[model samples]
Target: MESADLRALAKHLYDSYIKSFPLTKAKARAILTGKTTDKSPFVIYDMNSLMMGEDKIEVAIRIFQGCQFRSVEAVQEITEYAKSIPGFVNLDLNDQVTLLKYGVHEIIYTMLASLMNKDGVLISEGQGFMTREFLKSLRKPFGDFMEPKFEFAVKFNALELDDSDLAIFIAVIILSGDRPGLLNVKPIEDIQDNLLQALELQLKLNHPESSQLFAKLLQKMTDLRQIVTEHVQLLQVIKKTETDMSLHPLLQEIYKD
Candidate 1:
């Protein structure tokens, strides 16, 4: 039956997603501390210290540079994972780019729960914790962009989603057919329907006791969309004012109006 087939596909997608992005803080901590022989490079930075002795503009520029660098890498990883989604490659190439360009920020926000708690988010492979109050202290434009994310993360982490649930959630975000400038809509919609079904099934199986969890998740997606829109507008302001600051080409493409 098709239902059985979808369940199997959901399991496969979950497994593959976890393989691509492992979600364990313990493993990340080991890699960061040099206890593990793994050659992966993990650098830790204290946001409070990083801002020291720097003027507001200089601090903003430095933070933007780091965020842009990480965003570029995130785009690559998200794109690879999107390609693995069934029917993703079959869509029009421009549509594929459009979906990813619009969807990536939401996915990143959703995944932020992995490294975040109510107080702060873990940075640099779980070694550095940037407190919410410190981020708030940056004030205006730069810090404004971050504060909303912490607010979102604090509430989002309360859902207690495991990696398998997150995998499906990310897939739903990527396959959304409503992103503007899509060349082909029907096929994307069909794929999204299947993904949503998978998401509902996973939610039911995982969070059986939580009422309206699916609706709550959908609401979070709407909130993320607003947050991303505001973030882009703030970035545009920074772009115009910070003439010396450089944005990565990949980010430039995504954020361009």
Candidate 2:
């Protein structure tokens, strides 16, 4: 693709991503301060509730369920964004599902950085900030599950990528040919190579000061894979031990081996 075409593709991907996951710090702050009229779909879970003698197990379940609910919507949005990528919908139907099943968590974690800083992440569409220390206080499984994500987000935010950079980065994650069960690997690889080229160009154009940003972003992908793997292991433990806790069917499917 020509540079002009690549730029347009980047813009389209950026717009699609933003449309799917539109929370930003500014928007969250505006909403919290009543400066914006927009209403968020999420329910607020105040940290104060935990302070006021709320049951720890119940609160953990509530927050986990909230995340599960959000994941369903996120899967839909990610599917839409993936389809918007050039040549993505042309892949085998199973391939599309497989890519999404593996890639959704990674995408979600990556985007979480936008709503997070070093201390905590914004929850309930920026209505509240869920502190890292509070999350770490939850009982086994729940507390263990969140710390890695916070670690990843802190490092990821340090890279200082904007939506456009993340657009191509997400595309690269989805189109990865190494994902197991892909029937037509060549086409996926071809598309991924194109996306990587676009990503390098984007990083160069956007972060000219950081020569190693491209490599660092690629490293984050590896880190995400590790985090997701650990997450799946923890979920298995939860399913076996905490039988009463429910997971969304879609999440269950995604985490299936």
Candidate 3:
């Protein structure tokens, strides 16, 4: 089948181009579940953390801002990767930005879960990670802002997607056409449709015996959209509820309806 050839080519590109997983994958099932880890004594970990205070609103703003900062960095990388796809660079600039603008956070959170271990998300390379216990232990509004994302991350990481899987998945996310205000909807939508077909073939090739894996991965797409919607809701809450806080200009643009 020609589709099989396309899938094979896609798989080859994924294997050759994507970076290896940053965290060790030795603990297949155990690392994805949420149990508390003892506080690390490392100063760098504390330094990057939001300093909780009597001012609940400020604490919420700082934590939200920090996550947003890392998210921006991730989006930049995703945009770069999108360029590596065969026809992606030739797309209209408006459609390109529209996809990246709407899709980055969802894809970043998906890939970011790869860095998760039993402790929590590795917010930085090796040294900086935010523990579930520590995050939950924060003050009310601030803790509320974070826990939903952690929950999503936990469940997503539980899938145990490898780097090659993630590479294809990220491209799938970028080409998704459901985002509002696309001037080039039909073409973008066609691209994602072909990617979906390719992914179905590739998943079959990659996980020959796992009957439910492909269906479950597609189901995860719906879950990811729901989680991202909640993330935007939390951001809006912080903006409206904490009137004094300033949202990053980029976020201001990203969340615009």
Candidate 4:
């Protein structure tokens, strides 16, 4: 394909997928503005009494459930988006799964950040929202568990990136060559470079005020990596401390590394 055609195709796919649902752009805009809420000891105390009488097990379960659900949903969305891009699925299945599994948390959190506010996320349920302030206040296992991810979400939420930008940005994350164990590293890297260029092109065309946006976004990925590392550590903690609760099988599988 010609370079012009490829860029045009990238934009069309982004626009198409970004508008696919009632929950698309509007939800994407949730990260835009902040709102008022009750003062949270979770933020201040930071390892204190939010878990006192609260069912820590249930809280943990809900948190993991939310992650699993979002991870699966994001994978589906990314897969469909990738199929539109020529040569994406032509890569070997091993490399594909490696990229997907490795990048899944990053993609999931990026999408969640789009849907999030300073408060928290609205989960799969009606009124089934997890508040950021409350998450920050929990104790021990659950406290250690949820806070890093929520904190990362809070930071990314602060970026207030629009849906159009997020669509391409997410593609960059999934196509990244740096994902470990990629068998065809060159192809993956080539696609990622194309995506990075596409993202820059989109920002210039759509966001005139985006001189720093691309750089900031790259920094966000680093932040995400740090947060996920902390998350994995927390998972290890959960393995040792919390025995009674059964983690979701997928969570167990992903964390088994």
Candidate 5:
């Protein structure tokens, strides 16, 4: 890859949001200074949110309005949002599956940028931007590479429990930092415990082509089972448990990294 000044670009956003999401201030600096080697998940939220069509500064302004965490609650709104980011309860199943696959590659890509290399600022921004891209962007930057990109899977109306399984999946992935990875990598064994149940919830939204999605989900689950079986075995013998490390122990890990 060609070399460039990514750290400098990252700081522009970091410095701007320091007081807004002060918790992430140090983490952002870690990212820019090369002290940290991975763009922690919160960074996904803290950096300029280019993809969500909502600017970081804008998001900060909104979040700061009610959820400042300056002291104890300086930015609880952001922190609560960050905490919930791991494993959101119910969203589209396909979106959840997509997140597992995308998150796996993304963490690896982000780490590459965070590590010794210093030329991927815009690229590393993918955690939020690409996520927003996957979540909101209508125009596929690489339509050729993916399955015609799943249509928001459902309309943009507010959370409808009856929404497409795909919509539920994406919502949960964005909110909770917790999500099942493959079945074996499935952190919780019980299906109901994980938002996987969202899949079983009837699809109340009507769509003519929706039946095809059902067929796809069957295949998707089967595929996930296979992946989990293979990877769980690999993790048992090897040392790398990829999904687990993607989450920061606390928001601080992002800065201390």
Candidate 6:
């Protein structure tokens, strides 16, 4: 989907999930003004062309409805269910974050990113991981974006299946926003104020390998989570949501099949 289209859908999904009030086209304006609650945290997007870019990694935004996983274990058990999709990969696993060595700070940063977006900065919220060496190479860009609100910083929550990951999930939510937790979700502005800082964080060692050149394009992971977070809220309300299905929200427009 184009940027503006995603923005519109993001708003619809957000408002429907958060506010206890039912959705009505008339209420969209009120919701946009921040006059009401935004309960959902997910957005649906068509990423086929983006993820398949010449770059090895890419970012995409997809919509998810009714996300209601109770615990990480439940989430993991449903990992099969979570990834219920045949072609898509679930790169946001708790264990994956652990392997990436990201801590609570990365988690917080992403949660904050989910809450407020002016650009695609949050796309790199967890970039230091997948392409660590790639990130090391962007020292200049990283430095450029590192202003007060931005940094080569990341916030993440991970679990080893032995440690209590419940808190880690909570931590993820904190950085992402209350929308995933809310009854109605809202639209997220694709633009963030600190794009420069966001780019800088994509470097490796804090910087990285040459092959990871497409750091800026690797936004699918973040966008996917953002969309899923929306459904999580809706699932929380009406208990009939599928674990993985809830991970993304249930709007007909989102499904490819």
Query: lDDT per model, in order?
Result: 0.74, 0.80, 0.67, 0.64, 0.30, 0.27
Which numbered prediction scores highest in lDDT against the true structure? 2
Which parts of model 6 have CA positions greater than 4 angstroms off?
1-195, 201-205, 213-217, 221-230, 233-257
> Which residue window of length 10 is worst by lDDT in model 3?
38-47
Tens-place lDDT digits, model 1, residues 1-257: 27776688689887778666634533433443445454343232345455542332156566667667766777787888898899999999999999998998888777765666655655554545556666666645777777888888778778777777777788889998888888889999898888888888788878999887888888888888988888888778877877777887887888866
TM-score of 1: 0.84
Query: Of the pair 2 and 3, which is ahead by lDDT?
Result: 2
Per candidate, the number of residue pairs that clash is 0, 0, 0, 2, 28, 70
Cα-based lDDT at residue 171, candidate 1: 89
Q: Can you write out model 3's per-residue Cα lDDT over 62-117, one digit (the tens) per residue?
A: 65667777776666667777887666777889988898888877886787667665
lDDT of 4 by residue, 64-146 (tens): 65566666666676666666554578898888777777776776677766556666655442123456666665556775566
**Model 4 misplacement above 4 A:** 1-3, 19-22, 28-67, 125-128
TM-score of each: 0.84, 0.88, 0.79, 0.77, 0.24, 0.19
| lDDT of model number 4 | 0.64
Q: For candidate 2, report its TM-score.
A: 0.88
lDDT of 2 by residue, 75-153 (tens): 8888888999999999999999998988999998888777776667677566556777878778878988878888988
> Candidate 1: where is the Cα deviation over 4 Å?
22-57
Clashing residue pairs in candidate 2 (N, C-alpha, C atoms within 3 angstroms): none
Error of 2 at 3 (Å): 1.5
Instruction: Tell me the tens digit of each residue's lDDT in model 5 across 145-194.
Output: 11111221121111222213433332233332344443332432232233
**Model 2 weakest 10-residue run by lDDT:** 36-45
Pairs clashing in candidate 3? none
